[PDB]
Amino acid sequence: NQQDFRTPEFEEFNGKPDSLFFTDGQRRIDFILVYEDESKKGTNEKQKRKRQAYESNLICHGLQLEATRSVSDDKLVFVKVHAPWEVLCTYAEIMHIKLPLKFEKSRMNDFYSFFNPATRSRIVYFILSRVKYQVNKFGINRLVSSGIYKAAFPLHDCRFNYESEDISCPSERYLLYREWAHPRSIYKKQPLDLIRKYYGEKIGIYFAWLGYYTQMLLLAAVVGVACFLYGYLDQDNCTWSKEVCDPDIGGQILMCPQCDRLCPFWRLNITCESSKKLCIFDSFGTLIFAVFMGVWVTLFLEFWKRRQAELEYEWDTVELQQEEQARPEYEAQCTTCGKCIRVTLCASAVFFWILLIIASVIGIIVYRLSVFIVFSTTLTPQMATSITASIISFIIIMILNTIYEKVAIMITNFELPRTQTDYENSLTMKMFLFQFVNYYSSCFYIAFFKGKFVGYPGDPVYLYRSEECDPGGCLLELTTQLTIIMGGKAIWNNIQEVLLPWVMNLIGRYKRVKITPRWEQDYHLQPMGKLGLFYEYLEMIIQFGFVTLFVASFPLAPLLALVNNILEIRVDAWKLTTQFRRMVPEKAQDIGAWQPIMQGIAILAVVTNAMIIAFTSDMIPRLVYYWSFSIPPYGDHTYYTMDGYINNTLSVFNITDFKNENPYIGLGNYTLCRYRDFRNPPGHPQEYKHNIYYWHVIAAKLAFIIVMEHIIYSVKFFISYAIPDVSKITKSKIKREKYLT
Amino acid sequence: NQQDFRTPEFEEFNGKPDSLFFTDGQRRIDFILVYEDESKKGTNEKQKRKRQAYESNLICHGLQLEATRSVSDDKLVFVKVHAPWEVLCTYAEIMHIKLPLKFEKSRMNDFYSFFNPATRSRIVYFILSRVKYQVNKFGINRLVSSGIYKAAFPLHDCRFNYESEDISCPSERYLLYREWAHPRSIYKKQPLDLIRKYYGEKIGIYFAWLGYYTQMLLLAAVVGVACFLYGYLDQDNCTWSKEVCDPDIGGQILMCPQCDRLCPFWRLNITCESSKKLCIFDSFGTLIFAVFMGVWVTLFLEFWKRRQAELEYEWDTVELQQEEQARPEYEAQCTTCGKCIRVTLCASAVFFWILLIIASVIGIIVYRLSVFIVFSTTLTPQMATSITASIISFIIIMILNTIYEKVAIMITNFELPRTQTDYENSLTMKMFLFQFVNYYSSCFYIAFFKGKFVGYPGDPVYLYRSEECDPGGCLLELTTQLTIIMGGKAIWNNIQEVLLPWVMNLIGRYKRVKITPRWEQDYHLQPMGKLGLFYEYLEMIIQFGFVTLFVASFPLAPLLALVNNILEIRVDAWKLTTQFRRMVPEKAQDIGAWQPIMQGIAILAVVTNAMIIAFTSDMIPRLVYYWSFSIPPYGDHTYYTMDGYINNTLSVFNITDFKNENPYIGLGNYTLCRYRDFRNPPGHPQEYKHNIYYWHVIAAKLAFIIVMEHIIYSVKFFISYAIPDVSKITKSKIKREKYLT
Ligand SMILES: CCCCCCCCCC(=O)OC[C@@H](COP(=O)(O)OCC[N+](C)(C)C)OC(=O)CCCCCCCCC
Ligand SMILES: CCCCCCCCCC(=O)OC[C@@H](COP(=O)(O)OCC[N+](C)(C)C)OC(=O)CCCCCCCCC
Ligand SMILES: [Ca+2]
Ligand SMILES: [Ca+2]
Ligand SMILES: [Ca+2]
Ligand SMILES: [Ca+2]
Ligand SMILES: [Ca+2]
Ligand SMILES: [Ca+2]
């Protein structure tokens, strides 16, 4: 309970380059602790006065220790930590570690190299986190947080590129870099048993979920490519876009300008080329695919629950939850009624920053309104404006993402969560709320609030002059924004994931921190951090959002995400194998709070896809025209047909601007221009009021939302009721375990 | 393992009228078995050849037995079953019965009259169901099913009216009849600990759920009486019903007749009186109350989850689930692939009977259409028709209810569920599906499909001549139908619950099956059955439906259900205390499949209330008139006002019937009559087509459904997220148990 004997068989050794064992070769290295002492203001001795109080207690609890001085830094001392078999047995009786039995699997010790190095490192981390050093001081994480211990980590097995010098050691890192974690192995399956055996259940459940997500994205992408190619093969039979591109019809439709000054009266032919690709993006193929994706997200979640029950059997992820260690920052600071008011102030700060990113979207709006004029002066101006605004908004999103990463850490540190699980849950909800709003607010704007409230040419909506949409619809602008944000997020995040740990290791080598042992090799690496795969999970969840919430705009979002996921498995595996220091293995039975987040996104996606097809697509006005306004009482044709749709949908405007400016008489010499709204013609008794066709179309839009939402929610309820959550073979395996034991 | 010694210390005793102990007075009666043998075709001896094979094994497993002949029937033999302390201890070590500890509560035996008579009867029923008699024959339920044993039951404590003759015995039935189960005690609280102590966890959880449901119905009824009285106090300020009742305005509106022959052109004044009470039933009070009830059902379900976690602590309902005994009818009959096709045939028969009750509703439609003419010949005819049709449809519902009780038993017996829990789950889903459709199909018809598809006077919808609705709306017809069905179901079911076990006991006394002991007194009672409180639960769930799905029609459904529940607690408790034989206590941690059923009804109720307010109420056309058609572009008034609504909503019809009959020229000499639809006037370019006001109103109806559904579902999601499922004091009690143990 005191500091008398430390660091036994302390000697400097450098003879073996690749040895996971001690200098004697009897016992292996379960952990490495790293400190320095030899080089003010009374801080040094005081840490020496505390650090030894830890280490001696480690041998009073049974652990074997042995240090060597570092060969590069004379201050750095590497302490190898090993657990004897008796200490392993008692601290594996405390935590019910499930071992093979004669492979039947049961509690604290079973009948049968017995303990893998992964579960050995888990045992020694439990021991390292429990032992008291001292007021009451709890564990090792407080020492590493307080600058006492520089680094504590388990060792990797070998070099990832070269086979280990030991003949008895299985080169787990090398064989996991050859058959995984390498772009040479992009086609091969994932050795999920091997990656959990090397890494742990958190890493194994992330890569199992990522491989399953990629497999289901392959199905969604095949059906989406089928629907997109159905639109591409019916591209030549679209009546409305051919009528747009015809100069005898679509050329004559002279449109009103959108902004007040320095915007010309434009003919509809400049829409024409975009209109062609627009016929692929709101056809019946994207509607059928939106209904299919409403079914597919439920198949995804139900078969993930089945795969997760399969892994809860196969991997023994359901372990008894020991009482969790409190975080050191909580117990250092140590009423509850005031902590509640601190939490409310924290929530108000979070909603302040959410409203800041809303103001950033308002700034993007004002940018588009200012830059459309100068793009019309200096590939139509609105399409060029939309592509460059997508580029600029993606850059602003990536800039504000890092700033919220930092301030989300600060915001979650200001409130004090006692446990790491409560910390991660609060950070998960807060960080996802910002990433949701930050990544999808521009897309939700272009979908639901862009062009909807503009009014007619006389009396437009002034905030100044909210953005008017294209005659085809803002679906093409949404598709371009989605493609830019999704593909650029994939490319930029993969480039950052490749470079940033690699660049940090490179600058460490250049700061010079020839033959060298395993602990120095692993110490010159990047640590993952207390978060872990948080961000990894976050990224994919964002991608899931982009796949599901916005799938009615373009059906190639599963294909884009599938290409990204096929790259992402390898880039995550490569960085975790080579560039990162080895994490202690943990145990996780699910992906965490991300699964409630995904079920919430699945519920929201039905509403969002119905509102996309109704409001930002132009499928419902086309459908209503064909079925109701080409018949005799409202139209001239005898049978249902789609010709004359563009001439009979756009509304005429005589140049009568209200005197509450009158810009059109300066911008042109024309007297009548057509705009995209369904208001009455001039000279009506109710001129420029909403007409019978508008109210018919908006009733069909709302009836479509109602019918599609209720039908899809009922089909999702029936599919979730029909598919059992646990698989039949997994029930049989659990029943066979209960039968034998 | 064989039949050698049976029925020890067998003697006829009649000296003690009220003795729960044996003739010696040492040991108590845990069970009573009842058989008869002494009075063909070889059946008698064969049952004698089997019955003894049971009883001897009972003493080979340790139970003590003692029979007396009955004093009334010389054939009847009553066998008293007692468990010794050692047998109680071993079979309470098999099933982890939780006893007080020094009241801390833990497993198989604890430190401390020790076993209550309830848990003693539960132990002896476990023993009675496990012991083999014999091919393999399992337990006692097979003997009672096969006519071997006439009756097996635990004894009640005393007479319910009179205190027990024993001085040591607590008169549990009498004290539970004095402070509960008696209309004298209608105001008092429920002794929930005492009723679980006497009866078991299934009965205690039903009465805890019923008392909690009554308490929450008190809150819902107070707010509903507030909203109804707000409508009753604003009854004199309704502009539209006053305009209906005014003979200068509402008298002049001469309406078209509904059916083809023998129905007169009627003025709107005959609606007038109904219109007054109609102003209480679609006001803003019922709208505010519908939003409040969408919140209240979620508060109900969340606080039931909190009360249920409170009872899972306080009552020890979470016991280890022993492997359930298979049902005797399954194991008697004993491939699985053919059993699947039997299940599909069973499902097809169920949907055949559901479509039969749909045809019964179609017959009710044809009845109304036939009887409105003769009610117009022989209190307007449509209101008299609606009240008598509610009476006749309620009688037909009560007639078809019993028929489906019988055929649902037959349908669930045709498929073969192996376990009683799977049997009850399948019967719960099938029986609720029929009770749902049977009780609410007439109400859903009057709400959503009555008067909606009728067409204009020219070209009406012929099936013949689907029913036309009233100018105020079919909400008053729905309110009358709901009040009749709900109040009559309450009154009739309470009268049946009072009489039917009481009448069966009375006819048993009259068939004569003076001083008599406890086992004969309890044998001359009605057994509850293998179902138990199934039907009780069913009834209340139906009531819940009537409270929540249809709450927008009338706000006094919580008050009607609250009066019914205050009566229902006492009538259920009274019949279970006095008229029914004592059930063995069981263990239930929740109400069962009824809680998924209630969550489904809660989800459906939001949709149903939104569609009631939009479609079968007339609030949205009134609101659209006030906000949009009394302004200058569509109306004459300068400010928003509701006068002229009745004259400007109903549509004119010149008598131009299509020649595809022309009944109106025979039924009257009038040339123009007004009907309830929003079609264009005659002489229009689009005459009798739907107009701008119709499409405006239907767009507001669908936008109201969308806004109300999404707002209420979001508020319900936020309330379910904010309210934690387990209570804070209950977390503290569970943590204190984990702290002490
Ligand atoms: C909760 C997750 C997603 C929420 C997104 C909300 C969507 C809001 C968009 C919206 O309602 O737009 C208002 C109009 C749209 O009619 P449009 O004809 O698109 O407006 C004119 C556009 N044009 C001049 C270019 C021809 O539509 C109406 O006037 C009918 C109002 C019904 C909207 C209710 C939806 C959600 C309420 C919670
Ligand atoms: C799932 C649980 C409950 C389901 C109940 C479904 C409700 C069906 C009722 C319905 O849609 O009615 C059709 C019309 C109603 O317009 P009204 O103006 O009431 O019809 C004329 C009536 N009048 C002659 C006396 C003036 O409305 C329309 O034409 C718009 C159609 C939108 C209906 C979609 C709702 C549910 C779809 C799954
Ligand atoms: Ca990435
Ligand atoms: Ca990643
Ligand atoms: Ca499921
Ligand atoms: Ca009743
Ligand atoms: Ca009842
Ligand atoms: Ca909750």
Element at A65 (helix H, strand E)? strand A64-69
User: How large is the angle between the packed helices A85-94 and A117-130, nearest 10 degrees?
Assistant: 70
Query: Which amino acid is it at B378?
Result: T
Q: Of A586, A535, A533, A531, whose CA–CA distance to A420 is shortest?
A: A531
- Ligand 6 centroid–CA B535 distance in Å is 10
What does the alpha-carbon distance between residue B177 and residue B184 come to, in Å, rounded to a whole number? 10
What does the alpha-carbon distance between residue A367 and residue A380 come to, in Å, rounded to a whole number? 18
What does the alpha-carbon distance between residue A537 and residue A597 come to, in Å, rounded to a whole number? 11
User: How large is the angle between the packed helices A475-510 and A534-548, nearest 10 degrees?
Assistant: 160
| Measured CA angle at A245 (ends A244, A246), to 5 deg | 95
Flag whether residue A689 sits within 8 Å of chain B, measured between CB atoms.
Answer: yes
- The SS3 call for residue A253 is coil
- Ligand 5 centroid–CA B5 distance in Å is 54
**Pair of tokens at residue B305:** 């989850």
CB B623 within 8 A of CB B460: no
Residues pairing with B152 in the sheet: B33
| Measured CA angle at B78 (ends B74, B80), to 5 deg | 160
**Is residue B497 marked as binding?**
yes
Substitution target in A452, A695, A698 with the highest count of B β-carbons within 10 Å is A695
| Measured CA angle at B43 (ends B39, B49), to 5 deg | 95
- Size of chain B, expressed as the number of residues it contains: 741
CB B182 within 8 A of CB B60: no
The beta-carbon neighbor of A692 closest among B634, B692, B698 is B692
For ligand 1, atom 17: residue with the closest CA: A452
Centroid of chain to Cα A510: 33
- Ligand 4 centroid–CA A590 distance in Å is 18
Residues with Cβ < 8 Å from B172, sequence gap 6 or more?
Answer: B157, B158, B194, B197, B198
Residues with Cβ < 8 Å from B85, sequence gap 6 or more?
Answer: none
- The one-character DSSP state at B132 is -
Q: Of B237, B227, B220, B223, whose CA–CA distance to B285 is shortest?
A: B227
Q: Among all ligands shown, which has an atom nearest to the Cα of A535? A: 4
**Cβ-based burial of A526 (10 A; exposed 0-12, middle 13-18, buried ≥19):** middle
- B413: how many CB neighbours lie within 10 A of its CB? 12
Breaks (C–N over 2.5 Å) after residues, chain A: 39, 102, 112, 134, 334, 378, 463, 513, 660
Residues pairing with A267 in the sheet: A254
Closest B-chain CA to A608: B710
C-alpha distances (whole Å) from B599 to each of A564, B297, B544, B559, B593 are 40, 9, 11, 22, 10
Q: Of A22, A45, A18, whose CA–CA distance to A32 is shortest?
A: A22
The beta-carbon neighbor of B699 closest among A633, A691, A695 is A695
Sign of the dihedral defined by the CA atoms of residues A421, A424, A425, A426, in that order: positive
**Pair of tokens at residue A594:** 């991300």
Element at A69 (helix H, strand E)? strand A64-69
Alpha helices in A576-624 (DSSP H): 594-611, 619-624
B696 contact residues in A (CB cutoff 8 A): 695
Q: Of B656, B540, B627, B583, whose CA–CA distance to B212 is shortest?
A: B540
What does the alpha-carbon distance between residue A123 and residue A289 come to, in Å, rounded to a whole number? 50
Flag whether residue A509 sits within 8 Å of chain B, measured between CB atoms.
Answer: no
**Pair of tokens at residue A428:** 């998960």
CB B408 within 8 A of CB B427: yes
- A312: how many CB neighbours lie within 10 A of its CB? 17
- A457: how many CB neighbours lie within 10 A of its CB? 24
- Ligand 6 centroid–CA B90 distance in Å is 42
CB A561 within 8 A of CB A217: yes
What does the alpha-carbon distance between residue A403 and residue B237 come to, in Å, rounded to a whole number? 59
Site to probe by mutation for ligand 2, drawn from B478, B550, B611, B617 as the one with most ligand atoms within 8 Å of Cβ, is: B611
Experimental method of this PDB entry? cryo-EM
C-alpha distances (whole Å) from A234 to each of A239, A247, A271, A641 are 10, 21, 19, 16
| Measured CA angle at B76 (ends B70, B81), to 5 deg | 80
For ligand 1, atom 21: residue with the closest CA: A452
**Pair of tokens at residue B345:** 């045939």
Flag whether residue A633 sits within 8 Å of chain B, measured between CB atoms.
Answer: yes
Site to probe by mutation for ligand 2, drawn from A627, A695, A707, A718 as the one with most ligand atoms within 8 Å of Cβ, is: A707
- Ligand 3 centroid–CA A197 distance in Å is 24
- The SS3 call for residue B65 is strand
Centroid of chain to Cα B36: 39
**Pair of tokens at residue B568:** 């229902």
What does the alpha-carbon distance between residue A525 and residue A509 come to, in Å, rounded to a whole number? 10
Residues with Cβ < 8 Å from B706, sequence gap 6 or more?
Answer: A702, A705, A706
Beta-carbon pairs below 8 A across chains A and B:
33
The owner of tokens 């996802």 is A432
Q: Among all ligands shown, which has an atom nearest to the Cα of B305? A: 8
B706 contact residues in A (CB cutoff 8 A): 702, 705-706
**Pair of tokens at residue A302:** 């139900």
Q: Of A80, A82, A84, A83, whose CA–CA distance to A35 is shortest?
A: A80
Query: Which amino acid is it at B541?
Result: I
The owner of tokens 């992820």 is A317
Q: Do the Cβ atoms of A695 and B691 come within 8 Å?
A: no
Resolution value (Å, 1 decimal): 3.2
Is the shortest distance between the CB of A611 and ligand 1 below 6 Å? yes
CB B405 within 8 A of CB B434: no
CB B573 within 8 A of CB B495: no
What does the alpha-carbon distance between residue A575 and residue A568 come to, in Å, rounded to a whole number? 10
Flag whether residue A495 sits within 8 Å of chain B, measured between CB atoms.
Answer: no
- The one-character DSSP state at B318 is -
CB B87 within 8 A of CB B62: yes
CB B702 within 8 A of CB B711: no
**Pair of tokens at residue A703:** 């009836």
Residues with CB under 5 A from ligand 6 (ion): B 493-494, 497
For ligand 2, atom 6: residue with the closest CA: B448
**Is residue B539 marked as binding?**
yes
What does the alpha-carbon distance between residue A321 and residue A328 come to, in Å, rounded to a whole number? 20
Given the CA of residue A714, which atom of ligand 2 is nearest to it?
1
For ligand 1, atom 24: residue with the closest CA: A677
Flag whether residue A706 sits within 8 Å of chain B, measured between CB atoms.
Answer: yes
Q: Do the Cβ atoms of B695 and A699 come within 8 Å?
A: yes
CB A485 within 8 A of CB A390: yes
Is the shortest distance between the CB of A707 and ligand 2 below 6 Å? yes
What residue spans define the domains of chain B? 31-153, 189-620+713-740
What does the alpha-carbon distance between residue B112 and residue B110 come to, in Å, rounded to a whole number? 7
- DSSP line for A151-220: EEEPPPSS-SSS--S-SSS--HHHHHHHSSSSGGGSSSPP-HHHHHHHH-HHHHHHHHHHHHHHHHHHHH
End-to-end CA distance of chain B: give it in Å, rounded.
42
CB B697 within 8 A of CB B621: yes
CB B613 within 8 A of CB B316: no
The owner of tokens 């949908």 is A649
CB B229 within 8 A of CB B259: no
| Measured CA angle at B7 (ends B4, B8), to 5 deg | 100
Alpha helices in B234-335 (DSSP H): 239-245, 272-281, 284-314, 328-333
Q: Do the Cβ atoms of B607 and A705 come within 8 Å?
A: no
For ligand 2, atom 32: residue with the closest CA: A703
Q: Among all ligands shown, which has an atom nearest to the Cα of B704? A: 1
What does the alpha-carbon distance between residue B730 and residue B719 come to, in Å, rounded to a whole number? 20
CB A518 within 8 A of CB A20: yes
**Pair of tokens at residue A311:** 């892994």
| Measured CA angle at B456 (ends B453, B458), to 5 deg | 130
What does the alpha-carbon distance between residue A675 and residue A656 come to, in Å, rounded to a whole number? 14
CB A129 within 8 A of CB A141: yes
Given the CA of residue A454, which atom of ligand 1 is nearest to it?
24
Is the shortest distance between the CB of A706 and ligand 2 below 6 Å? yes
Q: Do the Cβ atoms of B698 and A699 come within 8 Å?
A: yes
Given the CA of residue A469, which atom of ligand 1 is nearest to it?
25
**Pair of tokens at residue B314:** 């306080």
Site to probe by mutation for ligand 1, drawn from A449, A452, A604 as the one with most ligand atoms within 8 Å of Cβ, is: A452
Sign of the dihedral defined by the CA atoms of residues B191, B197, B199, B204, in that order: positive
For ligand 1, atom 20: residue with the closest CA: A452
**Is residue B324 marked as binding?**
no
Substitution target in B425, B629, B695 with the highest count of A β-carbons within 10 Å is B695
Q: Of B54, B81, B57, whose CA–CA distance to B67 is shortest?
A: B81
For ligand 1, atom 19: residue with the closest CA: A452
Is the shortest distance between the CB of B454 and ligand 2 below 6 Å? yes
Rounded to whole angstroms, the maximal C-alpha distance in chain B is: 102
Breaks (C–N over 2.5 Å) after residues, chain B: 39, 102, 112, 134, 334, 378, 463, 513, 660
Closest B-chain CA to A688: B633
Flag whether residue A684 sits within 8 Å of chain B, measured between CB atoms.
Answer: no
CB B520 within 8 A of CB B79: no
CB A67 within 8 A of CB A79: yes
CB B286 within 8 A of CB B555: yes
What does the alpha-carbon distance between residue B674 and residue B685 come to, in Å, rounded to a whole number? 19
For ligand 1, atom 6: residue with the closest CA: A448
CB B592 within 8 A of CB B424: yes
CA distance B669 to chain A (A): 31
B705 contact residues in A (CB cutoff 8 A): 702, 706
Residues pairing with B153 in the sheet: B32
Window 597-616 of B: residues touching A by CB (8 A cutoff) are: 607
What does the alpha-carbon distance between residue B253 and residue B584 come to, in Å, rounded to a whole number? 68
Q: Of B606, B563, B591, whose CA–CA distance to B424 is shortest?
A: B591
- Ligand 8 centroid–CA A592 distance in Å is 18
- Ligand 6 centroid–CA B556 distance in Å is 19
Q: Do the Cβ atoms of B706 and A706 come within 8 Å?
A: yes
Element at B178 (helix H, strand E)? helix B172-178
